[PDB]
PDB file of C-alpha atoms in Angstrom:
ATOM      1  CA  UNK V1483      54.755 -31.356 -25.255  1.00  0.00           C
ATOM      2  CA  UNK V1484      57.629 -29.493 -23.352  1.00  0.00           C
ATOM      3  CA  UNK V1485      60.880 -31.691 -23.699  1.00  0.00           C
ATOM      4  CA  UNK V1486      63.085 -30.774 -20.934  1.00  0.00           C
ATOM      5  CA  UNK V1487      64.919 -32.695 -17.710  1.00  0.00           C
ATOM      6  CA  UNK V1488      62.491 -30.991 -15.016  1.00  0.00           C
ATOM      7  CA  UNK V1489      58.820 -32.598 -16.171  1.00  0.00           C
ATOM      8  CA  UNK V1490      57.547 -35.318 -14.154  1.00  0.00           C
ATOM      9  CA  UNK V1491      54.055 -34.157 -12.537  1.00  0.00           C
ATOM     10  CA  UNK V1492      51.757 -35.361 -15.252  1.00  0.00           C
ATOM     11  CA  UNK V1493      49.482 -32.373 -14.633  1.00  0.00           C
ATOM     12  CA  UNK V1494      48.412 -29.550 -12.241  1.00  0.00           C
ATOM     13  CA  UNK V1495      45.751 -31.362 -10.862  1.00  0.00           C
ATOM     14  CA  UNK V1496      42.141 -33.447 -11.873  1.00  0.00           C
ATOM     15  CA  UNK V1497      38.841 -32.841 -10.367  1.00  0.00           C
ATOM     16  CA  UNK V1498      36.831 -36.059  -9.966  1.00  0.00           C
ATOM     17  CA  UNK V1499      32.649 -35.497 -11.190  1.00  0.00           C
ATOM     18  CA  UNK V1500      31.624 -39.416  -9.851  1.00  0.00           C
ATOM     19  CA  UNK V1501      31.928 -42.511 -10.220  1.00  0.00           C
ATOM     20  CA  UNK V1502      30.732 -44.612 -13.252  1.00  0.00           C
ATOM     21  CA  UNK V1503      32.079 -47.866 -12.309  1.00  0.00           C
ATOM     22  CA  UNK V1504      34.636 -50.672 -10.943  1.00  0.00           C
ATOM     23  CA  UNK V1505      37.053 -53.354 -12.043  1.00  0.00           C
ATOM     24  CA  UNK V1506      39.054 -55.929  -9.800  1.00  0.00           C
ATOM     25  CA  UNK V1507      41.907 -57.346 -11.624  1.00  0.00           C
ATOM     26  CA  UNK V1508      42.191 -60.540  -8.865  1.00  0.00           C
ATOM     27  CA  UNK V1509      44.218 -58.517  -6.278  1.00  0.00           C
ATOM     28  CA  UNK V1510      43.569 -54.863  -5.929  1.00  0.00           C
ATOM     29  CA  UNK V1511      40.146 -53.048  -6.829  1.00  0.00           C
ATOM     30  CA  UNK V1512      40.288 -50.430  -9.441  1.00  0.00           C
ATOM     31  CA  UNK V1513      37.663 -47.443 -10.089  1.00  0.00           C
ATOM     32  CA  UNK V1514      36.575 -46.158 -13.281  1.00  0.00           C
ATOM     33  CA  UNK V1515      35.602 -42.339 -12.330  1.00  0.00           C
ATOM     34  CA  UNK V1516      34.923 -38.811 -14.542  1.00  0.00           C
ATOM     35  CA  UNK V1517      37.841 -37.150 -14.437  1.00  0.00           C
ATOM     36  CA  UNK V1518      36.853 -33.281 -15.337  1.00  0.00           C
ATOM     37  CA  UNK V1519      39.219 -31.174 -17.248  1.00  0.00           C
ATOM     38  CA  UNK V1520      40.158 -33.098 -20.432  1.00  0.00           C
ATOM     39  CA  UNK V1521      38.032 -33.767 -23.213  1.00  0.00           C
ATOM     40  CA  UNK V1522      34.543 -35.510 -21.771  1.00  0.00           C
ATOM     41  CA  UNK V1523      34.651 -38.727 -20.544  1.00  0.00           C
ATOM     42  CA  UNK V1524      38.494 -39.528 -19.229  1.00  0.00           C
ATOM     43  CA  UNK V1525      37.638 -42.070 -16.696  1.00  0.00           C
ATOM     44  CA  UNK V1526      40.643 -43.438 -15.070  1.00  0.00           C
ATOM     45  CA  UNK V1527      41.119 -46.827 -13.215  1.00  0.00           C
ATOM     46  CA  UNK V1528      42.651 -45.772  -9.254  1.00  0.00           C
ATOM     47  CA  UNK V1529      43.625 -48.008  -6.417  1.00  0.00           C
ATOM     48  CA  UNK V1530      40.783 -47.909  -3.944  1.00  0.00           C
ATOM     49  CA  UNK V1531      44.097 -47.881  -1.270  1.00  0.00           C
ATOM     50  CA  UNK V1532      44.947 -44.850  -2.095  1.00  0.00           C
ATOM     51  CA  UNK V1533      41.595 -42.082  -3.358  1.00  0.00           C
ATOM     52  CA  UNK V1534      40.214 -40.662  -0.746  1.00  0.00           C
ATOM     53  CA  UNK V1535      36.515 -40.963  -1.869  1.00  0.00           C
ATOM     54  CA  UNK V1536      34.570 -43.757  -0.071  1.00  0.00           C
ATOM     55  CA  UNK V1537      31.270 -42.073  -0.911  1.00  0.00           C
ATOM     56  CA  UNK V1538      31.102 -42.720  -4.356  1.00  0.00           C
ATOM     57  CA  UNK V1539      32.775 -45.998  -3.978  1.00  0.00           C
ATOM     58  CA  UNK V1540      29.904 -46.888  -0.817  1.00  0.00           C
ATOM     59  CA  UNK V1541      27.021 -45.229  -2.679  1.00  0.00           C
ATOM     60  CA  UNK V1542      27.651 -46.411  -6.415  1.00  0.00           C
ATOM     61  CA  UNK V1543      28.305 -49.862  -4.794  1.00  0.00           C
ATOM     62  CA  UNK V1544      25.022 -50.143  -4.057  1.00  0.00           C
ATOM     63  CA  UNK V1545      23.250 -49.381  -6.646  1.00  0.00           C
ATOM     64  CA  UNK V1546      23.787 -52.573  -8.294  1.00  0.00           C
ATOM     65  CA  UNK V1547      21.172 -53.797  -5.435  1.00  0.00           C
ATOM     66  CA  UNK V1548      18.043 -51.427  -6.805  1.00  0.00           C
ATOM     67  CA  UNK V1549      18.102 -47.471  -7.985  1.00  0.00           C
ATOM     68  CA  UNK V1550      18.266 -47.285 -11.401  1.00  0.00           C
ATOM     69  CA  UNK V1551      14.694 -49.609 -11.355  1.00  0.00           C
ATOM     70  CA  UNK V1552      12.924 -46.533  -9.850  1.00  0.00           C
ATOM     71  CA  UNK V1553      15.024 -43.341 -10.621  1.00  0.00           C
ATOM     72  CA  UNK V1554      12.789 -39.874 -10.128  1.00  0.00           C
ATOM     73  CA  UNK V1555      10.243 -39.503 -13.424  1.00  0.00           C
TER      74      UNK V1555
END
């Protein structure tokens, strides 16, 4: 912890690995994702108004429908 007047960034940047889930609170839709670079399993909640990742968000949506009842074994 650096205690100074010039430290506002939280970090230098997160990668994201996928998505693992989703969370409405009644207004705004949140997304629980990997976050890669901290200790194993960060998942953060983000607004889907502002990540820029409507793959995972269209693809893990989904799911819920039918994958993980076949899955490649």
């Amino acid at each position: 912890h650096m205690v100074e007047e010039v430290l506002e960034e939280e970090e230098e940047e997160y990668v994201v690995e996928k998505v693992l889930d989703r969370r409405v609170v009644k207004g705004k839709v949140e997304y629980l994702l990997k976050w890669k670079g901290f200790s194993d399993e960060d998942n953060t909640w983000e607004p889907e108004e502002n990540l820029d990742c409507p793959d995972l968000i269209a693809e893990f949506l989904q799911s819920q429908k039918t994958a993980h009842e076949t899955d490649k074994s």
